[PDB]
Ligand SMILES: *C(=O)c1cc2c(OC)cccc2[nH]1
């Protein structure tokens with residue numbers, strides 16, 4: 001079909017089928033996260049909840065990295081223009097919180113220019129949003145199992161430690 005290769009991200013089978021540039025500009029094949037439980041989240045530096053999200057994501061990674069937890073943080077400036085800096089500045093901001101998980105280059109998460117990984121996560125059965133599937137604000141979280149399937153979505157108001165009770169099921 002004609003829409004079978006334009007909308008081809010719709011039929012991807014897992015997160016592992018996508019690639020994305022890391023915050024240094026180097027393309028990363030996300031199939032490397034196979035066998036790991038992943039939190040995928042859109043981040044911002046100037047949000048009221050920036051400090052609580054970064055600190056708790058660092059907490060989670062420190063507690064469960066050896067269990068197979070990985071965190072993929074995608075900067076995004078679409079929500080209140082709260083991520084206006086360059087990738088290099090965002091990388092340095094994250095270093096101030098002692099971030100050891102994976103920082104990616106800034107993307108869009110909504111609209112036609114959204115990174116296709118985010119287009120795909122939003123249409124997964126367990127990635128459904130309230131009042132539509134669009135990302136509603138900074139620091140939405142998706143939990144991804146070891147096979148790259150979306151298993152849970154957490155809204156911008158849910159601090160990262162809320163995810164903790166769900167993790168042992170997927171390790
Ligand atoms: C796969 O990416 C895919 C399937 C599909 C269908 O299925 C009927 C309709 C429209 C666009 C589509 N993309």
Ligand SMILES: *C(=O)c1cc2c(OC)cccc2[nH]1
Pocket residue numbers: 066067068171
């Ligand atoms: C990581 O998955 C993991 C599991 C675990 C257990 O299981 C009882 C005990 C202590 C540390 C651990 N880390």
